[PDB]
Write an enzyme that holds these catalytic residues in place. Structure first.
Site, PDB file in Angstrom:
ATOM      1  CB  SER A 171       8.057   5.634   6.724  1.00 26.99           C
ATOM      2  OG  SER A 171       8.584   5.323   5.445  1.00 26.99           O
ATOM      3  NE  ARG A 181       4.302   1.235  11.403  1.00 29.92           N
ATOM      4  CZ  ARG A 181       5.346   2.045  11.566  1.00 29.92           C
ATOM      5  NH1 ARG A 181       6.500   1.781  10.957  1.00 29.92           N
ATOM      6  NH2 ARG A 181       5.256   3.097  12.375  1.00 29.92           N
ATOM      7  N   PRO A 241       4.824   3.341   3.622  1.00 28.09           N
ATOM      8  CG  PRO A 241       6.586   2.953   2.114  1.00 28.09           C
ATOM      9  CD  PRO A 241       6.230   3.701   3.398  1.00 28.09           C
ATOM     10  CB  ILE A 242       1.430  -0.702   4.792  1.00 24.21           C
ATOM     11  CG1 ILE A 242       1.541   0.502   5.724  1.00 24.21           C
ATOM     12  CG2 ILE A 242       0.965  -1.934   5.547  1.00 24.21           C
ATOM     13  CD1 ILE A 242       0.243   0.883   6.341  1.00 24.21           C
ATOM     14  CG  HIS A 249      -2.096  -0.798   1.181  1.00 24.84           C
ATOM     15  ND1 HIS A 249      -2.101  -2.144   1.477  1.00 24.84           N
ATOM     16  CD2 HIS A 249      -3.366  -0.487   0.820  1.00 24.84           C
ATOM     17  CE1 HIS A 249      -3.316  -2.631   1.301  1.00 24.84           C
ATOM     18  NE2 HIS A 249      -4.101  -1.646   0.903  1.00 24.84           N
TER      19      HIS A 249
END
Lengths: 59, 59, 59, 59, 59, 59
Positions: free
Chosen positions: D37, D39, D1-2, C6
């Site tokens: 940042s 994850r 960002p994930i 994402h």
């Protein structure tokens, strides 16, 4: 509305039952949608299955 | 904690900004986790991309 | 392996093509799995669809 | 960002710790985003919970 | 039951309406669950947002 | 196509093997896509990890 929350393993059943109720009302009132339509899914992550900045959640 | 909410297209920006704040506090207080660690993701679904019981959300 | 990343809207096509290649190799070599089996999915989030600590990603 | 990566059950802790680090750097450098940042979430699938072409992953 | 299907952009509305009905019945009968409880979500991916083996879906 | 189905814990292996086959064919024929390209992922939810209308799935 359908919410999927990812949380680290370790909480109690009462704590997760509370989370499901709280988040469910927050969505309901925020969107003026009927509570009965809200669906929540909790997905626990093992401390070793979550990375933050490249490091494991556990360390 | 990381929450991904799926909602049908149609809400206003203010409505979704409210949803993100409300749901974010509900998670924070429910799990006693720092608000700053909470991450929410809203995913809108086109009325024709959501099925309920086999029928489209739109009809 | 199947990865869904994402990211906030705003990157170029070349940037996302690079992200898909890089992340795809990292998974392959990390798990010693054939690259051909790796599947990546990029999901962009509108700056106003991402909350951090209760505040919108955009502000 | 994930990033959420779905992998079949069976890897060692060191292998998954490596995956989390590798993928995390790949995203960081690919998007020029700060590593802190990023994850990552690993979700293991039981060999009987993954279908490919209609057949189970296990067979 | 809640199913989220990721498909590449390009299908017609009728095609996706059919997909939602078919998949919805398959889940219902496979688990002997009431059709009315089944919820399907279609998520389209831009040809340039899907990687297979490191290469873009588009090429 | 990639489908992720969320179901409550409790089904047998044969039941889930069937679900994977059925849903996989439904997607294949609905989209006229080759079955071999279909990927299904089953994710079980503990009865206490699923909320409906604010109440737990279990009660």
């Amino acid at each position: 509305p359908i919410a999927q929350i990812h949380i680290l393993e370790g909480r109690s059943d009462e704590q997760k039952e509370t989370l499901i109720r709280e988040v469910s009302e927050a969505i309901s009132r925020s969107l003026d949608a009927p509570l009965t339509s809200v669906r929540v899914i909790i997905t626990e992550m093992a401390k070793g299955h979550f990375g933050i900045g490249g490091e494991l959640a556990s360390k």
